[PDB]
Write a protein that binds this DNA or RNA. Sequence first.
RNA 1: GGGUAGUUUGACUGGGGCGGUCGCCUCCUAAAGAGUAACGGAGGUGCGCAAAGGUUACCUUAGAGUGGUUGGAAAUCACUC
Length: 182
Amino acid sequence: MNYVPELKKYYKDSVIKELVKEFEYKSIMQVPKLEKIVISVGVGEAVRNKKLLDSAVLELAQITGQKAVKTKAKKAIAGFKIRQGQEIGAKVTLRGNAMYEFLYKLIHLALPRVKDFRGINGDAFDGNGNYSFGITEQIIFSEIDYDKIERISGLNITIVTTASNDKESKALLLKFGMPFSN
RNA sequence: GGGUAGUUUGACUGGGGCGGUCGCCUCCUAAAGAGUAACGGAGGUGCGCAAAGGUUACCUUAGAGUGGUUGGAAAUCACUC
């Protein structure tokens, strides 16, 4: 059995058809779809505190399911007293089935558990179908336990879509039921 | 141990002395082969690396614009040019 995420089932069985009708696309897979979700977290303070970076990496692992990579400093800078090549950030890429499952978990479970959650700004679009927005308190995810955290942390989420514009991606996200603050 | 004896204490230098300089590398002066002076005009150097070597395999920045918890012009990530 090729086990399939419920999001993938929902997409393939409805969303393709509604978007074809709604945007008069000539051929079927002109329809937008999702290629990757990038979860990033920038801990510049890790240059003092290694525990911060280790905790962030581990907590990302529990949140998603796959291990993270610690990015390095592209340039040595003094304003943040950064030496080139130091560990400064940590990111995870989600693709395919894991991507769909994570996005489902997020939208239905973790966005609800945010303090004063009143939707998400439906305008954080880079003009090319890529939607990036932040979450300040990782504790919204029930996966991580409260006691073991060493410092409350946030993280940025970027969703990359095959769409050529923002309208297409916003329509796809709305069909997915993404709680945009509107 | 200058009581006494034998000797040394450089050269370039727009006189000499003082000052500065003396090996080697990069560019201009140098007039489109090469070479070509000056106390002409600007820099570096008497090392480091057991990888920062060899080989195979796999990859590409910086900047401008746009969207994102710290994160601001600028830290990390996505996309366009």
